[PDB]
Design an enzyme around this catalytic site. Structure first.
Site, PDB file in Angstrom:
ATOM      1  N   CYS A   1      11.090 -52.392 -83.979  1.00  0.00           N
ATOM      2  CA  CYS A   1      11.788 -53.557 -83.532  1.00  0.00           C
ATOM      3  C   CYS A   1      12.314 -54.129 -84.887  1.00  0.00           C
ATOM      4  CB  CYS A   1      10.997 -54.766 -82.778  1.00  0.00           C
ATOM      5  SG  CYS A   1       9.443 -55.272 -83.757  1.00  0.00           S
TER       6      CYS A   1
ATOM      7  N   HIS B   1       6.954 -59.484 -83.078  1.00  0.00           N
ATOM      8  CA  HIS B   1       8.124 -58.965 -82.646  1.00  0.00           C
ATOM      9  C   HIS B   1       9.375 -59.419 -83.948  1.00  0.00           C
ATOM     10  CE1 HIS B   1      12.120 -59.003 -80.258  1.00  0.00           C
ATOM     11  NE2 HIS B   1      12.021 -57.733 -80.123  1.00  0.00           N
TER      12      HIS B   1
END
Ligand code: NA
EC number: 2.1.1.-
Length: 321
Positions: free
Chosen positions: A10, A80
């Site tokens: 990510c 994230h």
């Protein structure tokens, strides 16, 4: 470009927009060759990765200011990364590029064509895996070895038994025989015999408690050059080193297996960690396993914010390397 079969990159996808401002377009092969964490599909930090990419593509690291222009945000939350506003911002910096053109005239107008720029052998070609390993702008804090070399030495116990602190947290892929200590062994997922197993690519959970001595004993495979090993090891310093602070009792110590702090990311971590202890040392004990290996020993943890420069560790590591 594709990110085929990658579940933990990510951070890499968050760099795409930032790379676009510089005109850089990396494919899967180029991502993999530059950053080992991408190849192995592991958690990572955008800024850290951007440093490696800037070094390879431009021959200089982030301290050249090439990406200091706030154009794209990188937001971190709940393990994230994405591109929400309100995070650290990066972006190609024409002003910084102009400055660089003074020392390196051949780079003029070649920054944003998705080409690798090597001033060493003045060439402008597609990404080459062996090009621009070490940043030319950065003055190394300490000497590096010219050629990696395996070294057979003594066991770890003879370094650890000399360090004060009874209750010990051992973060390692393998166990150590520490009789004089009360050891709690944490290992990566899948390892048998340890007290606790965790995904060390997510750092250490504060639920582990606080100890007198935290021993971070994770190895990082050698690659290309001594400098590169520091690079490949930096994230571990950040992750496991930083998280260890929540696991230290007052007056506790932190022992970390490393390879120095040749790169910008590593030196940052050490500076941060140093302010929290009464003293900080760079050791090359007889229990090293290689030519490039060393140990950080932070003593007497008070969770404070004191003055810390790496000037003394710079002299210690010059003698070691
Ligand atoms: Na790095």
């Amino acid at each position: 470009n594709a990110f085929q079969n990658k579940a933990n990159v990510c951070w890499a996808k968050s760099l795409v927009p930032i790379l676009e401002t510089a005109g850089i377009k990396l494919n899967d092969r180029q991502w993999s060759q530059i950053i080992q964490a991408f190849k192995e599909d592991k958690a990572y930090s955008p800024e850290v990765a951007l440093n490696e990419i800037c070094t390879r593509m431009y021959g200089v690291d982030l301290d050249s200011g090439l990406f200091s222009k706030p154009l794209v945000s990188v937001y971190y939350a709940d393990n994230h990364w994405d591109n929400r506003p309100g995070g650290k911002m990066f972006g190609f910096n024409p002003e910084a590029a102009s400055i660089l053109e003074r020392k390196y005239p051949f780079t003029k107008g070649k920054w944003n064509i998705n080409k690798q720029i090597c001033v060493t052998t003045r060439r402008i070609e597609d990404f080459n895996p062996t090009t621009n390993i070490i940043p030319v702008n950065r003055r190394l804090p300490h000497s590096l070895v010219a050629e990696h070399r395996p070294v057979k030495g003594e066991r770890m116990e003879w370094l650890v038994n000399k360090i004060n602190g009874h209750h010990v947290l051992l973060v390692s892929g393998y166990n150590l025989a520490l009789p004089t200590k009360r050891v709690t062994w944490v290992a990566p997922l899948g390892v048998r015999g340890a007290d606790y197993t965790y995904n060390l690519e997510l750092g250490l959970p504060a639920t582990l408690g606080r100890y007198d001595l935290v021993v971070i004993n994770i190895h990082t495979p050698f690659r290309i050059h001594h400098y590169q090993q520091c690079v490949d090891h930096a994230m571990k310093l950040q992750m496991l080193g930083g998280d260890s602070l929540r696991l230290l009792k007052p007056g506790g110590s932190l022992l970390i297996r490393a390879y120095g702090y040749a790169d910008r990311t590593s030196e940052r971590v050490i500076c941060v960690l140093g302010r929290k202890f009464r003293s900080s040392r760079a050791l090359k004990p007889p229990c090293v396993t290689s030519n490039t290996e060393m140990f950080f020993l932070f003593s007497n943890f008070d969770n404070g914010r004191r003055n810390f420069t790496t000037h003394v560790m710079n002299n210690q590591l010059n003698a070691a390397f």
